[PDB]
Amino acid sequence: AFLPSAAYLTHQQKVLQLYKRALRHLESRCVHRDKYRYFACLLRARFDEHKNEKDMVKATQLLREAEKEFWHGQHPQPYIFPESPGGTSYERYECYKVPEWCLDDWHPSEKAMYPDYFAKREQWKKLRRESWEREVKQLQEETPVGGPRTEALPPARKQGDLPPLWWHIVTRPRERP
Amino acid sequence: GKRLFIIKPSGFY
Amino acid sequence: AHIEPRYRQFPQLTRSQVIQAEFFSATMWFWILWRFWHDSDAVLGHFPYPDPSQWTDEELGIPPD
Amino acid sequence: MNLFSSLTLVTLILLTMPIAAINFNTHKFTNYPLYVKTTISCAFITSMIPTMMFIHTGQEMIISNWHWLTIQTLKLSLSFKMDFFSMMFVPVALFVTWSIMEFSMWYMHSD
Amino acid sequence: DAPPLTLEGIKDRVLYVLKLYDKIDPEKLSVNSHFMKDLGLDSLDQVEIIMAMEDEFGFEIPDIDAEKLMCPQEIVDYIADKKDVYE
Amino acid sequence: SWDKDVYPEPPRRTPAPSPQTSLPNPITYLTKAFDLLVDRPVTLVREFIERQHAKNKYYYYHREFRRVPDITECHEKDVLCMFEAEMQWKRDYKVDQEIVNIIQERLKACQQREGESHRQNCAKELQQFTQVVKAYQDRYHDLGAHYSARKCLAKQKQRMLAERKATKEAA
Amino acid sequence: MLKYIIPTMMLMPLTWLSKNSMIWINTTLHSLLISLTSLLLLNQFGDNSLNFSLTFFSDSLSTPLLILTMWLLPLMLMASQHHLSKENLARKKLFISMLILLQLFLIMTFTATELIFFYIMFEATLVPTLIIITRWGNQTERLNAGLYFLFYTLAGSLPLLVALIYIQNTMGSLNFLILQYWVQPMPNSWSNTFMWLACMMAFMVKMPLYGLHLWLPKAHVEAPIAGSMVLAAILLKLGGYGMMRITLLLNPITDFMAYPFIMLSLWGMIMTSSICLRQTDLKSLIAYSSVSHMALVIVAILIQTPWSYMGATALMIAHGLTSSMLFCLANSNYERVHSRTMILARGLQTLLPLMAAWWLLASLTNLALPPSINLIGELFVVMSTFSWSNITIILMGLNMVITALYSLYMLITTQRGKHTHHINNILPSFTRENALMSLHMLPLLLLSLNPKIILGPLY
Amino acid sequence: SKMELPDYKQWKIEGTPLETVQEKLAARGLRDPWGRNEAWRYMGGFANNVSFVGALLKGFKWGFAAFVVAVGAEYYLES
Amino acid sequence: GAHLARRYLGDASVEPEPLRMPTFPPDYGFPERKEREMVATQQEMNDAQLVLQQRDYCAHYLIRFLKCKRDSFPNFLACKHEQHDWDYCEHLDYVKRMKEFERERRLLQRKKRREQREADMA
Amino acid sequence: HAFFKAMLFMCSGSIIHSLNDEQDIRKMGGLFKAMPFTTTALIIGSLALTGMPFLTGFYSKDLIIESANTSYTNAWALLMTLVATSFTAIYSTRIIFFALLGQPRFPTLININENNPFLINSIKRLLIGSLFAGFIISNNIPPMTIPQMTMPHYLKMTALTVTIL
Amino acid sequence: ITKDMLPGPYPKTPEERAAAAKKYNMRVEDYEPYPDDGMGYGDYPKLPDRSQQERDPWYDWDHPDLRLNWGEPMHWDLDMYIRNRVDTSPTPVNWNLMCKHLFGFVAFMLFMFWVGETYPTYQPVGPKQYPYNNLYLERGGDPNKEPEPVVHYEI
Amino acid sequence: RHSIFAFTHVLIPVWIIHYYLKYHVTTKPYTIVEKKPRIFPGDTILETGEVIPPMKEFPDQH
Numbered sequence A: 001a002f003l004p005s006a007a008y009l010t011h012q013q014k015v016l017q018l019y020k021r022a023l024r025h026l027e028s029r030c031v032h033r034d035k036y037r038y039f040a041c042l043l044r045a046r047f048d049e050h051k052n053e054k055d056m057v058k059a060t061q062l063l064r065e066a067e068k069e070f071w072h073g074q075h076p077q078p079y080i081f082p083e084s085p086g087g088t089s090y091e092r093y094e095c096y097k098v099p100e101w102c103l104d105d106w107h108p109s110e111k112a113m114y115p116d117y118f119a120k121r122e123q124w125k126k127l128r129r130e131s132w133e134r135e136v137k138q139l140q141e142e143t144p145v146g147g148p149r150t151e152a153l154p155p156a157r158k159q160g161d162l163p164p165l166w167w168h169i170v171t172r173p174r175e176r177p
Numbered sequence B: 001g002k003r004l005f006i007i008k009p010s011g012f013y
Numbered sequence C: 001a002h003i004e005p006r007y008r009q010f011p012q013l014t015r016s017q018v019i020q021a022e023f024f025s026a027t028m029w030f031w032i033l034w035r036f037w038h039d040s041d042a043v044l045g046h047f048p049y050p051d052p053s054q055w056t057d058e059e060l061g062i063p064p065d
Numbered sequence D: 001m002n003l004f005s006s007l008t009l010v011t012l013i014l015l016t017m018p019i020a021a022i023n024f025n026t027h028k029f030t031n032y033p034l035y036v037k038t039t040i041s042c043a044f045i046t047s048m049i050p051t052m053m054f055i056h057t058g059q060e061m062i063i064s065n066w067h068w069l070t071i072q073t074l075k076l077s078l079s080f081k082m083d084f085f086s087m088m089f090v091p092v093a094l095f096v097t098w099s100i101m102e103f104s105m106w107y108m109h110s111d
Numbered sequence E: 001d002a003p004p005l006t007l008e009g010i011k012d013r014v015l016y017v018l019k020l021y022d023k024i025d026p027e028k029l030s031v032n033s034h035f036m037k038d039l040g041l042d043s044l045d046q047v048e049i050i051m052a053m054e055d056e057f058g059f060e061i062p063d064i065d066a067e068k069l070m071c072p073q074e075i076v077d078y079i080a081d082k083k084d085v086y087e
Numbered sequence F: 001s002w003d004k005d006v007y008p009e010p011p012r013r014t015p016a017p018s019p020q021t022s023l024p025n026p027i028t029y030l031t032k033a034f035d036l037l038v039d040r041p042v043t044l045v046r047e048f049i050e051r052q053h054a055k056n057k058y059y060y061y062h063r064e065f066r067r068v069p070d071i072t073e074c075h076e077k078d079v080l081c082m083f084e085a086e087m088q089w090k091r092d093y094k095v096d097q098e099i100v101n102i103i104q105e106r107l108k109a110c111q112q113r114e115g116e117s118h119r120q121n122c123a124k125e126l127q128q129f130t131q132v133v134k135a136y137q138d139r140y141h142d143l144g145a146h147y148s149a150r151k152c153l154a155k156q157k158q159r160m161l162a163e164r165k166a167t168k169e170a171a
Numbered sequence G: 001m002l003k004y005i006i007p008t009m010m011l012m013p014l015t016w017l018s019k020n021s022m023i024w025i026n027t028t029l030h031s032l033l034i035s036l037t038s039l040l041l042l043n044q045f046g047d048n049s050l051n052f053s054l055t056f057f058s059d060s061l062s063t064p065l066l067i068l069t070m071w072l073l074p075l076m077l078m079a080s081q082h083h084l085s086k087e088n089l090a091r092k093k094l095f096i097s098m099l100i101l102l103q104l105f106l107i108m109t110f111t112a113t114e115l116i117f118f119y120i121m122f123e124a125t126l127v128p129t130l131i132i133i134t135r136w137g138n139q140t141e142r143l144n145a146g147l148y149f150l151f152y153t154l155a156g157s158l159p160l161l162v163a164l165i166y167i168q169n170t171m172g173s174l175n176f177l178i179l180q181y182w183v184q185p186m187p188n189s190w191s192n193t194f195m196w197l198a199c200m201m202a203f204m205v206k207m208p209l210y211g212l213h214l215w216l217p218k219a220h221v222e223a224p225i226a227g228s229m230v231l232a233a234i235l236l237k238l239g240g241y242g243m244m245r246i247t248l249l250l251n252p253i254t255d256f257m258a259y260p261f262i263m264l265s266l267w268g269m270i271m272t273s274s275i276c277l278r279q280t281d282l283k284s285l286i287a288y289s290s291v292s293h294m295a296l297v298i299v300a301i302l303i304q305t306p307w308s309y310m311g312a313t314a315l316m317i318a319h320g321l322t323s324s325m326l327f328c329l330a331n332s333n334y335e336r337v338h339s340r341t342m343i344l345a346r347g348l349q350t351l352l353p354l355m356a357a358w359w360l361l362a363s364l365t366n367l368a369l370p371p372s373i374n375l376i377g378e379l380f381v382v383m384s385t386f387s388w389s390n391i392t393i394i395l396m397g398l399n400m401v402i403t404a405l406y407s408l409y410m411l412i413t414t415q416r417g418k419h420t421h422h423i424n425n426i427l428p429s430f431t432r433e434n435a436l437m438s439l440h441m442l443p444l445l446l447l448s449l450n451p452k453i454i455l456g457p458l459y
Numbered sequence H: 001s002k003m004e005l006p007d008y009k010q011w012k013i014e015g016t017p018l019e020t021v022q023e024k025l026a027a028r029g030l031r032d033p034w035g036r037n038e039a040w041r042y043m044g045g046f047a048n049n050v051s052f053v054g055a056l057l058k059g060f061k062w063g064f065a066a067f068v069v070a071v072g073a074e075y076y077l078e079s
Numbered sequence I: 001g002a003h004l005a006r007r008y009l010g011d012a013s014v015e016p017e018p019l020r021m022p023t024f025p026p027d028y029g030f031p032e033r034k035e036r037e038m039v040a041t042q043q044e045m046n047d048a049q050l051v052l053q054q055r056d057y058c059a060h061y062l063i064r065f066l067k068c069k070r071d072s073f074p075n076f077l078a079c080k081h082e083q084h085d086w087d088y089c090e091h092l093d094y095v096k097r098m099k100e101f102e103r104e105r106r107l108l109q110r111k112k113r114r115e116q117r118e119a120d121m122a
Numbered sequence J: 001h002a003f004f005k006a007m008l009f010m011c012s013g014s015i016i017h018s019l020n021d022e023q024d025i026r027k028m029g030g031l032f033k034a035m036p037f038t039t040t041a042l043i044i045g046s047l048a049l050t051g052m053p054f055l056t057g058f059y060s061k062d063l064i065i066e067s068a069n070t071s072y073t074n075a076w077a078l079l080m081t082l083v084a085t086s087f088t089a090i091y092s093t094r095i096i097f098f099a100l101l102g103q104p105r106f107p108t109l110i111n112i113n114e115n116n117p118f119l120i121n122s123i124k125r126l127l128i129g130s131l132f133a134g135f136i137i138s139n140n141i142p143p144m145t146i147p148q149m150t151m152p153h154y155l156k157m158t159a160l161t162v163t164i165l
Numbered sequence K: 001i002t003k004d005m006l007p008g009p010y011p012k013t014p015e016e017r018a019a020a021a022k023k024y025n026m027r028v029e030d031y032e033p034y035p036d037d038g039m040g041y042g043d044y045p046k047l048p049d050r051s052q053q054e055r056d057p058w059y060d061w062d063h064p065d066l067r068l069n070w071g072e073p074m075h076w077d078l079d080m081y082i083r084n085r086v087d088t089s090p091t092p093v094n095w096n097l098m099c100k101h102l103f104g105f106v107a108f109m110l111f112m113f114w115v116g117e118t119y120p121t122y123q124p125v126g127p128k129q130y131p132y133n134n135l136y137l138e139r140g141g142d143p144n145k146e147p148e149p150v151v152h153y154e155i
Numbered sequence L: 001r002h003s004i005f006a007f008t009h010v011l012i013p014v015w016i017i018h019y020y021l022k023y024h025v026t027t028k029p030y031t032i033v034e035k036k037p038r039i040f041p042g043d044t045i046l047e048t049g050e051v052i053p054p055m056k057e058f059p060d061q062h
């Protein structure tokens, strides 16, 4: 369907995503923990019944009508975790996630307020600008002709070399700034 | 302790 | 000292919050029972509702013909 | 008359004073939320007196203190209606807002 | 509010949840115990382990990441990566 | 202060304080506290300022426009006369605007002052207001934003033709 | 009025004899002194207009437009000195000369006692504006935009020339002071119908009318920032000024000639606000907002009640300040991201908090938040159009809903949300930029205190 | 620093509604593996929570005692 | 509230219409019927500034109650007796309104029995 | 309404902070003892919302029901008003049931803490308000209409019976 | 940016369609333009008309607020299908069933308010009686006129 | 400097506003217009010395 690594979803992945959605929507329907635990074992039995199914057409058909089952029996307001998308606290702190390059535009009188932080930041910026050309030539020698097939990134192979395209993954902001 | 630096835009100007 | 968080078990309570919660629940029930003692009419009724069917015709002016 | 109208306008001017304080700042405050909570507590105190002397008599007045504009027959003035509705809603809203701000000093602390 | 997580505390809580799971005996369990190779669990069991991690720590692991966490050390490393521990 | 004739007020009748209870009311204590802490220092500073005013007194005057010939005795397209007539008409228009404002102030002050019996006790102010709004509407309404003395005279001539026709057909 | 014309001409040797690092500072300083001096025009009287000479006068309509015009020149010099920093010194002095000369034309456009002098100055204001757009505009479309700006105005105004010379031959004079006393009724005929069109269509183009507004979201977009400021703040209001002069002569034929144009503007304020709901260009969003605001001024002049004229002149001054500030905020982001696409730079309150405060206040004045003079002009126009017809309240209220929607949509799109990751040249706000924003906003807020000096000749 | 977690052996589901759940599952040959994870919710201090009439009648005993005292005080005060 | 069922699910020819009643004359059935005496003077309840909904036939107890409420400040629990006197006299006025309702309903019964007796006789 | 509804939101926010930004009632429970003061004030605010006798909500809502019954009224509007009065009791005890009563459903790291004097005092002043403000204001406001105090006993006891149902 | 990276006219030959599909960075088989009815779309792709809410929120988007990637062809109505605006996501109830239930509920409630207006409830009382000829002077009556005497009697 | 709040935020604004209202607002007509005080039977007018006559003696009901 839509994944950064794979081009599709396998049948097994679709069954597992269905099982997780069904347990979460069942937990929304079955608020109390013992009652949810009872009906979740019943649902585990309903998934373990057709588990050892080697006919891919029969398994695909059972998956499809199980999705129709789930669609008819979903909770209209399911429980969403707060930082999960849809939740009441999702993307709340994005207004406090100032990027790292905004520290470069500070006045020197407020860089003088944190001498060790900026003195320790300059070696990170130095490390990145010496890692950059090596990780570019690392990417261009490993990627095949016609561009990369997947969005997967290769790790660093030598010692002393940093992984390619590491800066905006490492220097991303925290979740509670 | 363990005070964290708070990255914020330049408030001097 | 402040409260230390616990794991999978009932948290540490302060004596102050428990006696305040008990005191305000007692104040609620004391006020409800006290006002129900002294007023007793804002709930059940202030004045007896008269029955119009038991009213005679002479006090209402109904001449028989 | 002189007490009622004066404490009426002192309530609103007292509520506008921390806006001037937050706008005329250079430093990081010595606990500006405590300052606004104390200001609204004292504004509740100030608003209780015209409420009490309305409960005494029923005293009402209009304070049309500042002529703002006259569009040929419509003299628009800064005009304050101190009636039953203002006298019973201003202390309720100030008392509630005082409790909401002392809640806010705890709830919105890490902000 | 919200006391910080350590890798020691996250690893203790993850192994604590997995020791309260009846298809894993606690005397075999370690941080490198692969659930299918070593502990011999089903993929349904792995989905349930991920849901217990979500109910334990209070955040959702997405399925593209939930299908790949196949040992407790991977789970602790992922919760470290999404909570930014050892600041 | 102001002139009590143009802004009338019926005389105040406050009742004597006749307290039935024994608990002292906070209002008298806060009134004495107001008098001591607020009213006397305000009065002292105002007396100081009024002494400084009394050291050097000087005056401003109300500008008296003498009545010039109005638009009816000005010739057609005679700008030197009808300019004076137009300035007279505009000053009279602005003064009539302020007259309607004074009567609205009387009406609203009456409504607030009489309180709950304002529908009965403000019949004279309502009558004066209806009369002056009738006069203002017959005099200046529907003239347009390019109003002038010619427009107002044409409106008056149309109204007087209608009134003469209605009085003629009633006989 | 000669005490304002002469220093504005003396700004030309002041900008050509200045030292090469001093040509912005000197013109800014002395244009601020002229703007200080502009307040002597507030010597207004309840009966008579301030009548200077045979050539110049100033009633209470032309006076706020004059003070806004003389105030706009230093702010245009502040706005336009950063993107013309690498310019040649001679071309920089030519830009400043075109700004000074446009002010020189405008300050004796509004004070023209006689109407053909008004026409000569009114159409003289095309040439420095055309040179500014087609010379210091940024993209390719500035030449086409200069064509549309020139050839809508002259197509509208060359019938106006024949109309004014006809009035000169019939009445004997185009003095507005004489025509206040020699005005004759204009009856119903086809000759007087085309008389009305020739007197009105030039100003309908300059406002702009809906349907004739197509010069505007190309001229206001493809200009530089000083061009956008003067076009949004003064050059649309030349049309409303000319309407309020020339509708003295067009009675009673306006009382039924106004209906198609009242329909065009009452529906154009809905349609252009709806267009603002779906703009990708921020500068074009401000352009169609200007069309939406000037539609109400057109309706208020065409219904010609006193409340409508008061609201129209208040809304003209308020919209001049507000739209000039919105274009300057748009420029403050364009000088960082180098694109006028509104969806590109997002989340800017996380980066520029005080500039986001200026965005908030200009979006609040755009949605007519009381007691701003935006709301005063908006509200008086709504009162007068309700007295005109009671069903116009539907269109006025629906316009106010869509106006609040696109104002706060502009605010939320540019300032709120997660910031754009790949943009890292977001500098902090310069002192010049914040000073420009405050010199727009602070007079606009102080005019709420004493609003009687912007309510026209019939306050 | 180190937050010491309690025993995992102490959370046994005997005496809880998890026991009734596992009985009604073992009636059909099903067995629940996450009951000891849920077992802390129903044991210790969180066990035996009040009903709703027990929730409303919080502070009824001291409030009714204060009501008895105040009625007795005003009956002894009128005399 | 059964009279709503008697007017809607029954006939309205025997049930009184509340907007227009009394439909019968106030002397029809009353020999020498006395009037409702007004105790509170018109100028007294003008000076007391009573609400025009509150200027009914028992305004005098309301004036006494408002006088006690003004005079017993701040003891806001001091004038329950004047309040209960005013509430009792309002209750009596409400009983009088119920008597008007029952009088009109029984005279509609009288008119119904009259026309049915007339249809049986003639 | 100001007092008890502000206090209901403050009690809910105390629950939200103590359960780590959790706003869903299906992940609550057992807060009757873990959060005793929030529980006390939430029960008091729910009783004042439903029209418990002689709390602050009584002196307004009971008069509203006894005046909407005893008037020339849209009958369907009155019947929907009484159904709404029952629904208030239903969702108030939904709040009390899922948020306070039962067994815990929140995650396992209990950081339940309502021990700040800011929180305690801020809930306390509106709690004194929710106990006494209806009585105090109803005895301090002057009469502005004539209150309907005579009605049949099924019609006087409408709000309390429908709330108990 | 240059000329052959800008949108063009409607593609008619399959090599113009392939060049446009390369231009909008998508497959030739997935590239469909808007139909050439002259409305002014040119060769711009007709994307499947989904809101950005339906996009995968867990995928690492290049624009996480927009759920959109760099170089991806935007929808024509991308300003319209933002998450601040029109949502097209699948609803737990069918659209027509939602519309029928909401319209039926609103219509039934308005019909019952009209029925209850036609059949109002009241109390078994007479009209409220007032002294001084139903308060003639108090209701703004002029004193030069004299009203008809409105006399109320005891019962 | 312990009660500087009740000085600088009340006692200076009550002075300023009372000076303003006393010598610039009540010096102009109908700016501060007050509802006249409520007069009951039994009251004595301070401005006149006039005593209001009481009500008629009640036809007592209970």
Ligand SMILES: CCCCCCCCCCCCCCCCCC(=O)OC[C@H](COP(=O)([O-])OC[C@H](O)COP(=O)([O-])OC[C@H](COC(=O)CCCCCCCCCCCCCCCCC)OC(=O)CCCCCCCCCCCCCCCCC)OC(=O)CCCCCCCCCCCCCCCCC
Pocket (backbone or CB within 6 Å): D022, D023, D024, D025, D078, G353, G354, G357, G358, G360, G361, G364, G365, G369, G370, G371, G372, G442, G445, G446, G448, G449
């Ligand atoms: C003639 C003498 C006059 C004296 C009195 C002056 C009267 C007012 C004048 C203008 C006031 C506003 C200007 C300052 C704000 C703009 C800049 C800014 O953001 O500063 C923040 C900054 C403090 O914030 P920060 O945290 O440091 O940084 C900003 C943050 O990063 C991020 O910022 P933020 O978002 O956190 O904070 C912005 C905040 C955001 O909040 C809002 O936007 C909410 C505002 C709208 C809702 C509330 C108001 C609704 C209307 C009611 C009020 C008016 C009528 C009241 C009367 C009673 C009713 C009739 O806005 C405010 O706090 C503004 C407060 C004042 C609001 C006035 C109305 C603005 C709304 C839009 C127009 C409305 C109609 C026009 C009203 C005109 C009234 C005169 O302020 C300052 O440092 C102040 C600098 C100096 C300001 C001087 C202002 C006057 C200058 C005039 C000079 C010439 C005359 C001499 C007199 C001088 C007196 C001092």
Ligand SMILES: CCCCCCCCCCCCCCCCCC(=O)OC[C@H](COP(=O)([O-])OCC[N+](C)(C)C)OC(=O)CCCCCCCCCCCCCCCCC
Pocket (backbone or CB within 6 Å): D065, D066, D067, D068, D069, D076, D077, D078, D079, G371, G448, G449, L016, L019, L020, L024
């Ligand atoms: C901390 C600073 C405060 C002052 C400290 C220093 C002074 C110490 C204390 C003494 C007080 C000052 C001396 C007395 C004050 C002046 C008295 C006086 O006559 O002043 C002249 C007048 C009084 O009104 P006026 O009627 O005399 O004059 C109006 C002017 N004409 C007639 C031309 C229209 O002005 C003032 O007092 C100005 C103060 C205004 C206060 C309100 C501001 C409102 C802000 C928002 C504006 C928008 C509202 C729009 C809507 C309005 C409703 C429709």
Ligand SMILES: CCCCCCCCCCCCCCCCCC(=O)OC[C@H](COP(=O)([O-])OCC[N+](C)(C)C)OC(=O)CCCCCCCCCCCCCCCCC
Pocket (backbone or CB within 6 Å): G152, G155, G156, G159, G162, G163, G166, G191, G192, G194, G195, G197, G198, G201, G202, G205
């Ligand atoms: C923005 C672009 C469009 C602009 C539109 C401008 C307005 C549209 C109408 C303009 C009409 C022409 C000017 C009329 C001046 C009236 C002066 C006068 O005395 O009139 C009375 C005179 C009357 O004649 P007279 O004055 O000799 O006689 C005395 C008067 N009577 C008759 C009573 C005895 O009218 C005319 O002579 C003719 C007027 C109509 C002329 C029609 C030709 C022009 C057609 C429209 C062209 C519009 C622009 C097209 C191009 C756009 C760009 C490509």
Ligand SMILES: CCCCCCCCCCCCCCCCCC(=O)OC[C@H](COP(=O)(O)OCCN)OC(=O)CCCCCCCCCCCCCCCCC
Pocket (backbone or CB within 6 Å): G394, G397, G398, G401, G405, K083, K084, K085, K086, K087
């Ligand atoms: C006594 C009379 C009583 C009458 C009562 C009934 C009258 C009104 C009838 C209904 C009309 C208004 C309601 C319809 C418009 C609602 C718009 C709205 O609320 O949009 C919100 C929407 C997102 O909302 P939501 O789905 O909740 O988001 C959850 C997270 N995604 O946000 C978006 O999608 C963004 C939308 C931005 C653009 C808005 C475009 C629509 C504007 C509508 C204007 C209506 C003007 C009405 C004029 C009336 C004149 C008389």
Ligand SMILES: *C(=O)CCCCCCCCCCCCC
Pocket (backbone or CB within 6 Å): I001, I002, I003, I004, J069, J082, J154, J155, J158, J161, K121, K122
């Ligand atoms: C006749 O019944 C007059 C009373 C008003 C109309 C009926 C109101 C019914 C609802 C209130 C009583 C409910 C009893 C459970």
